[PDB]
Design a protein around this ligand. Structure first.
Ligand SMILES: [Co+2]
Length: 269
């Protein structure tokens, strides 16, 4: 039997732009259970993350006044976000087309799935991704990433950019004099990956390298076998400076590294 998935069920009776896939945040659809689920997840992560999350993340939560006790009102969060970096969040139904996603980031709009899991959803999107948008360097990296979507799509290279996003925005680590810390949203909203990614001898931790990352496969249904480590958000933004076109064409005929591989030139940490 095939039954409707959560995206389908949550969006019953709602609409989305056929081009940019946005909708007004459906505030009336959040139940008491939803706000309680949000509060539980928020409390859980805030207990786990001190000394694991990078300091910029935890500061972003406070500066944006991300609600501890209910699903945040997107309009209200946008007041603080816009004043900080000129970014805003927009509600989407769930997974959206790539050109749409990129066009949003290119225009300093961060798409956020509106609905919450039952006890990627709004907790992952808002709690995991949004706090770093208050950091001007990180925000500029995301904008530059978004702007690269047009060229990538024209060259059939969206999956190569997707690897860069996965291994930075979703699963990135940042080294600090106080020790290794986390900036990837997929780790920051996770119950357990926050522990494994810093505490386990199992995963590789490899210095950030643009070409290497864009040549590296990933899997979505398991903890990462490799994490890439930056020294600063400036490293990410600076990585977007050169022309990616000749990089895509070189990668196109290469054999990608497996998710668990160490490459001969890796700086292994
Ligand atoms: Co994500």
């Amino acid at each position: 039997f095939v039954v409707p998935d959560i995206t389908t069920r949550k969006n019953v009776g709602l609409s989305h732009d056929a081009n940019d896939f946005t909708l007004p945040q459906p505030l009336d659809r959040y139940s008491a259970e939803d706000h309680a689920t949000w509060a539980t997840l928020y409390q859980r992560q805030c207990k786990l993350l001190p000394g694991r999350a990078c300091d910029e993340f935890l500061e972003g939560l406070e500066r944006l006044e991300v609600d501890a006790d209910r699903v945040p009102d997107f309009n209200k969060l946008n007041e603080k976000l816009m004043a900080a970096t000129g970014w805003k969040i927009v509600a989407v139904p769930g997974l959206i087309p790539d050109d749409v996603f990129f066009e949003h980031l290119a225009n300093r709009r961060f798409p956020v799935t509106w609905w919450l899991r039952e006890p990627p959803d709004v907790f992952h999107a808002l709690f995991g991704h949004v706090p770093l948008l208050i950091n001007p360097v990180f925000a500029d990296y995301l904008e530059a990433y978004g702007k690269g979507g047009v060229k990538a799509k024209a060259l059939g290279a969206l999956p190569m950019l997707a690897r860069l996003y996965w291994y930075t925005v979703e699963f990135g680590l940042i080294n600090t004099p106080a020790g290794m810390r986390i900036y990837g949203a997929g780790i920051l909203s996770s119950k357990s990956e926050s522990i494994y990614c810093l505490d386990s001898a199992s995963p590789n931790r490899v210095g950030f390298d643009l070409m290497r990352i864009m040549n590296t496969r990933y899997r979505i249904d398991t903890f990462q076998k490799t994490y890439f480590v930056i020294d600063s958000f400036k490293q990410l933004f600076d990585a977007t400076a050169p022309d990616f076109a000749p990089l895509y064409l070189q990668l196109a005929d290469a054999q990608p590294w497996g998710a668990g591989d160490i490459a001969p030139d890796d700086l292994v940490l």
